[PDB]
């Protein structure tokens, strides 16, 4: 159907079915250096996102359901507005200021989970 | 029982490539990473780490990096091949003090013009140290003509020793020893991890170390082997000694076109009278400082030993004198007035100036330093010494130098590079 | 609390709570080449460790409990000394000579596990 | 026993016990550039395969049992011929033309599985 | 049913960039990876692989790599532009044997001195092949003056063909064919995987292949198309033929300064008498060897065919003679004494020597080979031939060459580069 970013204007729940479409598009000596820098950067950016998913316990997934509650102060909206009316670009603007808080919480709940699972073994 | 852990705080000694960072330069210009305005430092509690400043490869990297930057900065500048001609020289005799008698030569020559069909008769002033008498008693050549090509530094690139920060690549870390009274080797407590080194100014000098860092509490003596007379002793002061240098001659500059788009910067007539370049060191300060140095040398040589200071041994000008670049000109000052004592206003050190410079210890790549107009005045801090021991009841110390690695070793002595090794295993009591 | 390597002088069980702190810090043409080599190497080293965890069955984890027994000959100490007195730097020296043996055993038990799990499906 | 590619002439079921052997072997300015390009490429190729395993739900595995049926039209052979007579080089030629079909099916079944698992939580 | 496997031993033909490894060189110096002292080789049981030496891109890479290294090694050396002047030449007539009569020229000229105001009258000896008579019957110019700039090789960089190992990057592998009696194309059993190639010496030559590897059992004839007379035939011997070459003239060298830091290395007077350079090939050995070559040619041309050997056809010196570099000097030897027979002590091959060399088949980049002092003696192995078939009951073979790729193709014929493709799928009987 749609190709890369074709779902950008779609709602969040219509999109998020195309996650593999975007994931797969992330992959004279002076010209050689400029291109190696571009390629090295693409790899480094990719790996930082993968490392981050790993420490949150979401390695290998495109959709990862976590064990952190949603604070209503981050966005006081119902699922109907978020998944049926909004697009991902709009959502990203709405909660930009809470991104680092959420990320810190995700890392911490994984550290606790990982240890509890060791004690049970 | 085996449990695998990743992200374990373990490291090993390692050698890697560090990158430069910084807040018209010869050295760090645009090929340098902007610094972090709020750099981090982390104290490591209960960590003892062995450091060895004499085997620190950060010194070798800095030496290589500054030489390569130096050369890259001269590569595009004007070649002075047309200047290696027979010169007709006389003495500059107008209002010359005795100290300058015979120091300046007034030389005329036939130089290339923009057009290949024409030559021009031009003249310029040279220092006696820049020329060689040949044959015809007035005939001279530049000193480098039988050895190497000479290029003119571009008079837009300054030699100011702007500080460079070295930073580790990911996977590596730089450990810093904060143990006061650390003598360069062995273990030390009080180790911290830093993202980058402090800024280090690539100041080039012999005998006296200028504008560096100071010891926190006491004057320190550091050496690879204190009983080996073949090794140098680095001395770090805990207080600066101020030195004031000058070239009290109002010079002018003239531009001689030597080709289609190229020019030679020549020294023109000098305004006012002619005086010798010199440096002033406060005498009382020097004596107090020397006081402290001897007190510390006695810890290794005996408190009933006679410690004598003497001037340098023979060798080339670059070795026997205190060489430095200030105001854009290269000075060679006589330090025999500083190192002339048994045990322990101002002291005036006369200086010579050169225009043709052979950097480091290389042969084959000479540069011409364009003259600076006006009068030069410099104020700097002596922060240390390079001494060599001459050697049964007495020891004599003399000024040393000429090996630039000794001037960086004195700033990088606190840093070590290690490699992070995040995997490890240990017994636990669980089973998959 | 502590930043990068701040736990280096701490005991093994006090440390190992800071694993994400260290994991996240692992990420004129001549100058360009020197820096690309440094960046390429950082990536290659990172990936070798991740590949190794993968073949041992520990992908995506910071703490991975395996199915290999501990030979008392590698280190005849009780959990109390290892986790409460020793630091990780000391431990690494103590068992340096057994690292390759342990790694070989981890790879082999995973190969057997992976096959048994195929036969059960 | 065997080193890299030593199992190349072995049958498919004799091979496939050596998967870690091959997996571990995948890891003047002009000379510097040529070598950086070779190293950057090795990393990019490695990561594309890992990304692909991830979207199929096989992250971290050397053997991954999926939920896609085998169409007899891709290769009408019994397990005895495939695993006991054929080598992997022969097999690769036999089904080369169906590789993209199979890959598309693997991606799609994972997308459906991943969503069903979200609804169950 | 679909099961995914990763790490599957599957590969495809591929072209990649190989890197050099090795255990003052022109070629591999410091821009080369140190080798593994204990390299691996893995025999692949039951693997048949198709090889084609004529389409092997490892040859193209080696050709490009050696030319680029060659040029990088001349780039920083002294330019001899000042030498392209009118020369005044006479004959060297002192104690000259007949074979050398007219071979050496004694030439004087006005050369640049370190100073731009002065010239010097100097002289040097040149070989007849290095100069062109112009106009005034004594006036000459160097041969390259109407074609190209010439540079002097730095007399510190040797031309010794130090062996280079080619190694595959990760994700790739090099397969080696160990099948004895492999003729360069088609499938072969007995394939092994290697980390790197054996060391290959970048020996440059025409007609005769020197210091290479030998066939394991029989002399082998290899060609792209044996019935196409437009293709060359490479012949690999199973035994070496020893060849001894020399320049029996005690030469001296003199250094002429031609500028500020530059010098020309000229041939000075020659000590002793003047004799012709030559190479000795054992006659019996050559005959036995040629014996074996014909026996094998008959397999393709008929055992009732008359196989004749003949000398080279016309062309330039670089084509019609056996060119090689030994002892640092470039020899052009006459091989008509080796290829003069129907079917099938020592044979002496006279040689000429040149100082001005145009490498490969390029025009525009000439080099001057500085003279070597003393007397040159070389001992080397002839390991093969390059033959061209001249073509109804007889066939004539003549020496060929001039295309350097043929000299590497003869060493790299056993290697193939493949790409590893670790993913695969297969039906299994399990379900997620
Ligand atoms: C250096 O020598 C030059 C001449 O080569 C001096 O210049 C001349 O000075 C006289 C003084 O009466 C003038 O009349 C001439 O016209 C000047 N010649 C030129 C070409 O300008 C010059 O003053 C000498 N400089 C010093 C410092 O002695
Ligand atoms: C440095 O200055 C000192 C004195 O200021 C010079 O010393 C003189 O050197 C000559 C050489 O034989 C002696 O005869 C004099 O007696 C020395 N004077 C004193 C006061 O000792 C010294 O030569 C200068 N050095 C340089 C390199 O110029
Ligand atoms: C010589 O050393 C002194 C003492 O280290 C330097 O003066 C200090 O410079 C820092 C820079 O911010 C100031 O914060 C200190 O207060 C200064 N100390 C004093 C007493 O003024 C001095 O600048 C150094 N001189 C040179 C030329 O670098
Ligand atoms: C090449 O020619 C030069 C002269 O251009 C010869 O050198 C001269 O040899 C005579 C012999 O009596 C000497 O007296 C001269 O002094 C030499 N001239 C110079 C400039 O040295 C030279 O010997 C000739 N070389 C050969 C090989 O014939
Ligand atoms: C190579 O050596 C042979 C003989 O050693 C030279 O052959 C002579 O060539 C001339 C050319 O017309 C003939 O007239 C002679 O009869 C030939 N001699 C023999 C014995 O055949 C040959 O020219 C030399 N080649 C080169 C390139 O110098
Ligand atoms: C010519 O070929 C012979 C035979 O291949 C070379 O001699 C061999 O060199 C290897 C090198 O280690 C020795 O192990 C063999 O024992 C040698 N064989 C003999 C019979 O001595 C010979 O070195 C080659 N010559 C040159 C100049 O390379
Ligand atoms: C764009 O908005 C219209 C409004 O209803 C919607 O129907 C359409 O599907 C949207 N585009 C996409 C890609 O969904
Ligand atoms: C939600 O966020 C507010 C601040 O925005 C914080 O005070 C509150 O404790 C948070 N709630 C929870 C459950 O953490
Ligand atoms: C959100 O989507 C629903 C879907 O029917 C629509 O009815 C509603 O009006 C939308 N709300 C907004 C604010 O766009
Ligand atoms: C995020 O910070 C900006 C800073 O001005 C603020 O204007 C914006 O409203 C903040 N966003 C939210 C969702 O509060
Ligand atoms: C010395 O300086 C005075 C100052 O005016 C000047 O007049 C005089 O000519 C100078 N001497 C010479 C030789 O130029
Ligand atoms: C220049 O001054 C020196 C001082 O010693 C003297 O020896 C020399 O002869 C002078 N030259 C001329 C040309 O007066
Ligand atoms: C410049 O060239 C002329 C040409 O005859 C010469 O006479 C004069 O002495 C040269 N000038 C100098 C300063 O050498
Ligand atoms: C520096 O301190 C160490 C500590 O053991 C000592 O061994 C070494 O000799 C000292 N260096 C000097 C120059 O005394
Ligand atoms: C230090 O120098 C003395 C001088 O002879 C030498 O004997 C001693 O071995 C040196 N120390 C070391 C550690 O080499
Ligand atoms: C250097 O110049 C400063 C300027 O104020 C002066 O105070 C200081 O005493 C001078 N130092 C010497 C050694 O003369
Ligand atoms: C330097 O200190 C010594 C200590 O004895 C003293 O004798 C000497 O006069 C001092 N020199 C100066 C210049 O104060
Ligand atoms: C040097 O001073 C120290 C200070 O305690 C003392 O122990 C040592 O014996 C003294 N040496 C001499 C030669 O007096
Ligand atoms: C050191 O002082 C002595 C005193 O005679 C002098 O001869 C010697 O040349 C001086 N050294 C230097 C480098 O000036
Ligand atoms: C060294 O000290 C003595 C003491 O009288 C003095 O005469 C001599 O000039 C001094 N040397 C120097 C170079 O100042
Ligand atoms: C140098 O001479 C120029 C001539 O105008 C004058 O303006 C300048 O101030 C002088 N410089 C000094 C330092 O006296
Ligand atoms: C350092 O050792 C002391 C000794 O008890 C300990 O209390 C402290 O916590 C240690 N440092 C760290 C970071 O744990
Ligand atoms: C423990 O290691 C020893 C050798 O260090 C070995 O002989 C023994 O079999 C090992 N034990 C087990 C259970 O593998
Ligand atoms: C190990 O840690 C425990 C904690 O209480 C302490 O009591 C014990 O003495 C420590 N042992 C050693 C050898 O440090
Ligand atoms: C590891 O090998 C070294 C080699 O000398 C040995 O000294 C050390 O004791 C060994 N370590 C252990 C834990 O046995
Ligand atoms: C090669 O084929 C033979 C035929 O039976 C087989 O026994 C052998 O094991 C095969 N090679 C490998 C590596 O399995
Ligand atoms: C099997 O493949 C054929 C085409 O090759 C297709 O028509 C058929 O529907 C496929 N079977 C299944 C179960 O998808
Ligand atoms: C397949 O392998 C079995 C193993 O015993 C053998 O009997 C059979 O003949 C083989 N078939 C073919 C076609 O090679
Ligand atoms: C794959 O396509 C090629 C194209 O010619 C065809 O010949 C081959 O038989 C196809 N393979 C299969 C298994 O059908
Ligand atoms: C040099 O020798 C050749 C030999 O043929 C002769 O023709 C030529 O005329 C000689 N030249 C002179 C100058 O004698
Ligand atoms: C060198 O130049 C002079 C200038 O007249 C000329 O006569 C002479 O013949 C030249 N020498 C040569 C060898 O050409
Ligand atoms: C090499 O062997 C192959 C095997 O089929 C053959 O076809 C080819 O013609 C042979 N090459 C020559 C030159 O005969
Ligand atoms: C080999 O050369 C003959 C010469 O005519 C030609 O006809 C034949 O087609 C060539 N073989 C191939 C495979 O092209
Ligand atoms: C080459 O020199 C060696 C040195 O011993 C000698 O034995 C050999 O026979 C020579 N070869 C020829 C062809 O003369
Ligand atoms: C070379 O071999 C042939 C074979 O017939 C023989 O006739 C001829 O005389 C041999 N030549 C030499 C030099 O032995
Ligand atoms: C060449 O020798 C082979 C060896 O068997 C033979 O079969 C063939 O017929 C021979 N050809 C001629 C022309 O005799
Ligand atoms: C080959 O030999 C013939 C014999 O007449 C000769 O004419 C021809 O020039 C020779 N070829 C070469 C390159 O010398
Ligand atoms: C070729 O062989 C004939 C046979 O007599 C001989 O006369 C002739 O000189 C030989 N040619 C060469 C170049 O040796
Ligand atoms: C070359 O001549 C020099 C002159 O001394 C002599 O020493 C040397 O041995 C000679 N070389 C040969 C190979 O005869």
UniProtKB/TrEMBL annotation, chains A, C, D:
Residues with an annotated glycan are 71, 78, 85, 97
Q: Where in the cell is it found?
A: Virion membrane; Host cell membrane; Host endosome membrane
Q: Which regions span the lipid bilayer?
A: 1-17
Signal peptide region: none
Q: Quick one: where's region Fusion peptide?
A: 1-14
Region Immunosuppression, as annotated, extends over 34-52
Q: Which cysteines are joined by disulfide bonds?
A: 58-64
Write down the superkingdom of origin: Viruses
Membrane association type: Single-pass type I membrane protein
Coiled-coil positions are 93-121
Query: How is this protein named in the record?
Result: Transmembrane protein gp41
Shown residues in whole-protein numbering? 516 to 658 of 860
């Amino acid at each position: 159907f749609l190709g890369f970013l074709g779902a950008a204007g779609s709602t969040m729940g219509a999109a998020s079915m195309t996650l593999t479409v975007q994931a797969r598009n992330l992959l004279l000596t002076v010209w050689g250096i400029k291109q190696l820098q571009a390629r090295v950067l693409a790899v480094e950016r990719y790996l930082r996102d993968q490392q981050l998913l790993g420490i949150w316990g979401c390695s290998g997934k495109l959709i990862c359901c976590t064990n952190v509650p949603w604070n209503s102060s981050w966005s006081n909206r119902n699922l109907s507005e978020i998944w049926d009316n909004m697009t991902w670009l709009q959502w990203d603007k709405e909660i930009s200021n809470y991104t680092q808080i959420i990320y810190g919480l995700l890392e911490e709940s994984q550290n606790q989970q990982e240890k509890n699972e060791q004690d049970l073994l | 029982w085996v449990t695998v852990y990743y992200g374990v705080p373990v490291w090993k000694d390692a050698e890697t490539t560090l990158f430069c960072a910084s807040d018209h330069n010869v050295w760090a210009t645009h090929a340098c990473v902007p610094t972090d305005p709020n750099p981090q430092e982390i104290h490591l509690e209960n960590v003892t780490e062995e450091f060895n400043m004499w085997k620190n490869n950060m010194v070798e990297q800095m030496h290589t990096d500054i030489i390569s930057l130096w050369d890259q900065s001269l590569k595009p500048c004007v070649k002075l091949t047309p200047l290696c001609v027979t010169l007709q020289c006389t003495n500059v005799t107008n209002n010359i003090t005795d100290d300058m008698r015979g120091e300046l030569k007034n030389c005329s020559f036939n130089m290339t013009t923009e057009l290949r069909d024409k030559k021009q008769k031009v003249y310029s002033l040279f220092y006696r140290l820049d020329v060689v008498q040949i044959n015809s008693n007035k005939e001279y050549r530049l000193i480098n003509c039988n050895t190497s090509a000479i290029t003119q530094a571009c008079p837009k690139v300054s030699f100011e020793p702007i500080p460079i920060h070295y930073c580790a690549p990911a996977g590596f870390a730089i450990l810093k020893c904060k143990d006061k009274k650390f003598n360069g080797t062995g273990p030390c407590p009080s180790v911290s991890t830093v993202q980058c080194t402090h800024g280090i100014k690539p100041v080039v000098s012999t005998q006296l170390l200028l504008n560096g860092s100071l010891a926190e509490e006491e004057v320190m003596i550091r050496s690879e082997n204190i009983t080996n007379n073949a090794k140098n002793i680095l001395v770090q002061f805990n207080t600066p000694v101020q030195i004031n240098c000058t070239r009290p001659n109002n010079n002018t500059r003239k531009s001689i076109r030597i080709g289609p788009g190229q020019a030679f910067y020549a020294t023109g007539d000098i305004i006012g009278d002619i005086r010798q370049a010199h440096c002033n060191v406060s005498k009382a300060t020097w004596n107090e400082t020397l006081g402290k140095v001897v007190k510390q040398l006695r810890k290794h040589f005996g408190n009933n030993t006679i410690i004598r200071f003497a001037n340098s041994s023979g060798g080339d000008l670059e070795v026997t004198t205190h060489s430095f670049n200030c105001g854009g000109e290269f000075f060679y000052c006589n330090t025999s007035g500083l190192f002339n004592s048994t045990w322990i206003d101002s002291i005036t050190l006369p200086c010579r100036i050169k225009q043709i410079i052979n950097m480091w210890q290389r042969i084959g790549q000479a540069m011409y330093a364009p003259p600076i107009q006006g009068v030069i005045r410099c104020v700097s801090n002596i922060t240390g010494l390079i001494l060599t021991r001459d050697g049964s009841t007495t020891e004599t110390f003399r000024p040393g130098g000429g090996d630039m690695r000794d001037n960086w070793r004195s700033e990088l002595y606190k840093y070590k590079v290690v490699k992070i090794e995040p995997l490890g295993v240990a017994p636990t009591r669980c089973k998959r």
